Amino acid sequence: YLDRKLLTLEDKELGTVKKGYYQMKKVVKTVAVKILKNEANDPALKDELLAEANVMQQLDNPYIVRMIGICEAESWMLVMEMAELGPLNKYLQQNRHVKDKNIIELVHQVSMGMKYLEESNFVHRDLAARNVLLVTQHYAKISDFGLSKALRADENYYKAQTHGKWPVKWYAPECINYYKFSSKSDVWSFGVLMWEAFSYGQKPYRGMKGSEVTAMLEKGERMGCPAGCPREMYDLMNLCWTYDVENRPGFAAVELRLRNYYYDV
Numbered sequence: 001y002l003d004r005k006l007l008t009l010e011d012k013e014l015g016t017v018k019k020g021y022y023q024m025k026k027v028v029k030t031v032a033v034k035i036l037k038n039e040a041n042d043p044a045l046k047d048e049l050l051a052e053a054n055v056m057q058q059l060d061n062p063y064i065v066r067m068i069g070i071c072e073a074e075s076w077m078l079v080m081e082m083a084e085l086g087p088l089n090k091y092l093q094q095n096r097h098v099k100d101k102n103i104i105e106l107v108h109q110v111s112m113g114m115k116y117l118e119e120s121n122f123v124h125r126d127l128a129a130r131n132v133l134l135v136t137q138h139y140a141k142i143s144d145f146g147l148s149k150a151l152r153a154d155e156n157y158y159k160a161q162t163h164g165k166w167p168v169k170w171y172a173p174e175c176i177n178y179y180k181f182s183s184k185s186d187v188w189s190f191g192v193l194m195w196e197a198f199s200y201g202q203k204p205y206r207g208m209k210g211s212e213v214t215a216m217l218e219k220g221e222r223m224g225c226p227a228g229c230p231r232e233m234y235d236l237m238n239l240c241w242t243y244d245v246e247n248r249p250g251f252a253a254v255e256l257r258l259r260n261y262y263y264d265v
């Protein structure tokens, strides 16, 4: 638990998300803070951010945002290390001349963080371009573990009771149809994330309802190749969008396909 006296929050927001500065043992660290109301509080929101903090406490990878901790003060706060450039989709909407090599580098970093998460047997369940935050234009980190789950020791999937309020345009068919979430389900979401990154942060399945997306995917239809997207990257998106969960690659296989150097499998 963090000391409120060591935290300074900026007034101009990024409940709310504020930029702040947290005094460490010697240096001050720039932080991003999710703030929840203490009075008109939503217990389900409080439970979600507590669950998120529990997941973050168990993760340690260069491509996953690091948690500083929780501060219980005039409001309930979840304090993270700041990724200054913010969400990848917004960044690419505002910076349309980022080179192909650079987009490949960024999505490769996400695949490295996801290969770790897969190894760690956690499912992300909200893997979208908005949840990739940029440290620099050459360093991406995965964020928003609010829907993440630690897999049971005897299963490779998390079974939701039924459909909740979900980011359905990023979900694999087994998620929509059977409410089963595996690291393979995150690979499908990663394919949608790739499409977003090569479409300079455009929304996937523009103008379609979730039910229309489900019917499109069941028919074997997929989003078209983004204008100017490298052919090899579009091919990798289609492999990520393998309908059958058993034939879809895991993140180890996907991460290999995003490397820009010779390697052995």
Ligand SMILES: CCN(c1nc(NC2=CCC3=CNN(CCCO)C3=C2)ncc1F)c1cccc2[nH]ncc12
Pocket: 014, 017, 032, 033, 034, 065, 078, 079, 080, 081, 082, 083, 084, 085, 086, 087, 133, 143, 144, 145
């Ligand atoms: C996305 C908000 N955010 C972060 N945010 C940032 N950097 C940002 C830098 C600039 C920016 C502009 N907009 N946003 C998104 C605000 C949330 O809607 C921005 C985020 N770095 C690290 C972060 F951790 C968070 C803080 C606390 C808990 C959290 N869980 N999931 C994300 C998150």
